[PDB]
């Protein structure tokens, strides 16, 4: 009877949306993985089989110097104590940035998916673009604690 949202086969449908008031951002949520094909629409779940109720829901997206309304360009402005909202189907969950870190361009472990008691929302936003090697050197990924 109640709502029952589930990443369907419409890899083309936003599974939901995401916004942050302290960062002033509002964008769609497409199904993982954040592979180029998906990143073509919006912040996709850093992982394909992400769960609607995963102990850690990760998401990733490129950044834009000339565009703060991009995937995660205006995030660098948001920080701890930041109230984060996650909208999906007719349900609106909530998270609050509890931890933030960075790592070389290969620490995939950022997907950080272990804490379950207090689920979380692993944010992933790449930046520090290099023009010599033509690639992103530093990686930015914030974790958020479920509060709803």
């Amino acid at each position: 009877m109640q709502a029952k949202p589930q990443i369907p086969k419409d890899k083309s449908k936003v599974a939901g949306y995401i916004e942050i008031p302290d960062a002033d951002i509002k964008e769609p949520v497409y199904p993982g993985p954040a592979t180029p094909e998906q990143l073509n629409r919006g912040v996709s779940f850093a992982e394909e089989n992400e769960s609607l109720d995963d102990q850690n829901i990760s998401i990733a997206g490129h950044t834009f110097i000339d565009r703060p309304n991009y995937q995660f360009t205006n995030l660098k402005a948001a920080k701890k104590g930041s109230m984060v909202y996650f909208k999906v189907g007719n349900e609106t969950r909530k998270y609050k940035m509890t931890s933030i870190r960075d790592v070389k361009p290969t620490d995939v472990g950022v997907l950080d998916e272990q804490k379950g008691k207090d689920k979380q929302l692993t944010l992933i936003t790449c930046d520090d673009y290099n023009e010599k090697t033509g690639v992103w050197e530093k990686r930015k990924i914030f974790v958020a604690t479920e509060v709803k």
Partner: peptide, 4 residues
């Protein structure tokens, strides 16, 4: 880590 995804997101290039």
């Amino acid at each position: 880590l995804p997101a290039t």
